Structure formats: structure tokens, C-alpha cells
Structure 1
Amino acid sequence: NQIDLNVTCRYAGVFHVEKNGRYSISRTEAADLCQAFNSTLPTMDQMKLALSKGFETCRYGFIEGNVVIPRIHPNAICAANHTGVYILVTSNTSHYDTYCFNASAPPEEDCTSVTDLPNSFDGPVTITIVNRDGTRYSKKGEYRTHQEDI
């Protein structure tokens, strides 16, 4: 019973979380997942400020109100070569990665590793935070509050 959470650098508190190496997070799960990091889904303004500090990914993820990809450098296979916060407009499907926002993180680029999941609750899952540098933090718990996400 294991969940891998790949996480990034934070940029003005905003970071990306990919679950189990595939688009697998629902909007309800995303809010619960960010809550386990004492975080919330970023607002569009928070995400735009993170972008300005150096944040970009090549993956769709929830923010408050939309599913987006922050892009700095145009890449044909990431958000159809767009720059800025690219907003997904048309999709059949509901599961993506998520972004999270931690107000207590540093104001600009923070590329230290994540070493805690501070607000997970008691539960049976081995949750492993996987940093981009491969360092890992694991803890037994749960963060999903909606049965349909389990």
C-alpha cells in the first residue's frame, strides 16, 4: 500500500506534485494532498508569481479554478510551445498532477529537498516523497478524505 509523490523545487511557495508517475490526481484529491503539505492549491496570481521566479514544468496540474502548465521556455511538446501560465481548455478527462502553495516557503527559488509531509493523518499507506535529486522521505499515513479517491 504505497504512494509515491514526486515533488519539485518551490518557487514563491509553489511546487508541483506528481503521484505514482502518472496523471492520477482528482481535484478533490489534489486539495487533500496539498493540505498534507500544509499547503493549498495555488491561485492563478500565486502561480504567475512563481513562474516569474523561475518555475516551469511540462505537466498539467491543478491550481484553484484551472488545470495549468507554467512555461518559461517554449517547447513544442510542453503546452503546445506556449509560454506563461498555459491553461488547459479542452480535455475529456479529469485526472492530472497538482500544484501546491506553501505560504511559509522562501519567497523566490527554493531548490532544497522536501523532507517532511507534516500534515498527513493516521493511516495505512506508505507515502514516499521523491525529490528530483532522488532523496526520499517516507511516512505511514493517509491524506485522502474522499472515499472515491482511494
Structure 2
Amino acid sequence: NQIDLNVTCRYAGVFHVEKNGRYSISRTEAADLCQAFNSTLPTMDQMKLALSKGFETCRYGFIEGNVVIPRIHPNAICAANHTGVYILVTSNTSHYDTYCFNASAPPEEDCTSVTDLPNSFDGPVTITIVNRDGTRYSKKGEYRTHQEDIDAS
């Protein structure tokens, strides 16, 4: 099996992770993914600080306690032309992307390549980090601690 993880630059430590090119991360997998990056699900305050430093996406992703989308510039297909952090009302079983907060990141924008999942563990999956510059970093292992996430493929 292969898992591809597309990662953005970090803004006040917050970054966006998309798995396998589609909305595919469960609530339980999201926290495990951030922890494999030595990171945590952001608080809303952390997300708002990231937004003030230049962070926006056009994707829903988990934070602590909610699924959200951060917007700086109005775009009609990203939270329907709104700005700010908007919260998605959703079932707890739906899959999205995830956001993560790294406490050792710089306060501003950090676009250096991410080269490892430092807290991955043993397993059979080839896990590939895909950076904005096109470089990719692969290792064999696992990061999911919930068997339900592994069984759901």
C-alpha cells in the first residue's frame, strides 16, 4: 500500500495536509497524522494566527474540535466568497483533509521542504511526503493507531 501526503508551507506553525489527492482523512486519522509530523491538531487561535501570517486554502480540514476552511482573499468557490475561518457542519464520520501545528516552526512563513515523518512507526506502507517544490520523500512504516482507519483502507 502507498499513502501520499501533500504538505503546504507552515504559517505560524500551521500547515495543511492532503492525503491521496482527495478528501480521505478521518477524525481519528487526522490526529495520528499530525503526531507523526511531531505536530498537533491546531486550536482555533493557532489557525487565526496562521491566517494573519498568510495561510489560506480552498479545502476543509480538521482542527481541534472542528472541521474548518481558512480564507484571506474572497473566492466564490472557497467558503462561498467569505474571509476568515469558517466551520463546516458535518457528520463525525465524514473524511476531509487535516491541518497540523508544529511548535518548533518559525513565527512567519516557512516553505522549506518537509523531509521526514519523525514519529512514524513500523509498518508495511510506503508513505511519501510531497512538497510544494515537487520534491518527494518516502519511507516505509505506519502512523495510524486506530485499526478502524487501517481496515477502512
Task: Calculate the TM-score normalised by the size of structure 2.
Answer: 0.95
Counterpart of 2:9?
9
Q: Percent identity?
A: 100
CA distance in 1, matches of 2:93, 2:76: 22
CA distance in 1, matches of 2:124, 2:72: 39
CA distance in 2, matches of 1:64, 1:56: 17
RMSD: 1.2
CA distance in 1, matches of 2:113, 2:75: 26
Classify 1:28/1:93 alpha carbon distance in 2 versus 1 (closer, same or farther; 3 Å): closer
TM-fit CA distance, 1:86: 1.3
Post-superposition Cα deviations, 1:88-115, rounded to whole Å, max 9, x if no partner, equal 1256961000000000011111111111
Classify 1:146/1:91 alpha carbon distance in 2 versus 1 (closer, same or farther; 3 Å): closer
TM-fit CA distance, 1:50: 0.3
CA distance in 2, matches of 1:90, 1:63: 13
Single out whichever of 29-38 and 79-88 deviates more from structure 2.
Answer: 79-88
CA distance in 1, matches of 2:44, 2:121: 28
Runs of 4+ displaced beyond 6 Å: none
Aligned residues: 150
SS at match of 2:58: coil
Q: Which runs of 5+ in 2 are unaligned?
A: none
TM-fit CA distance, 1:132: 1.7
Q: Which runs of 5+ in 1 are unaligned?
A: none
Post-superposition Cα deviations, 1:73-95, rounded to whole Å, max 9, x if no partner, equal 00001111110111112569610
Task: Trace 1:1-150 onto structure 2 (pairs within 5 A).
Answer: 1-90=1-90, 94-150=94-150
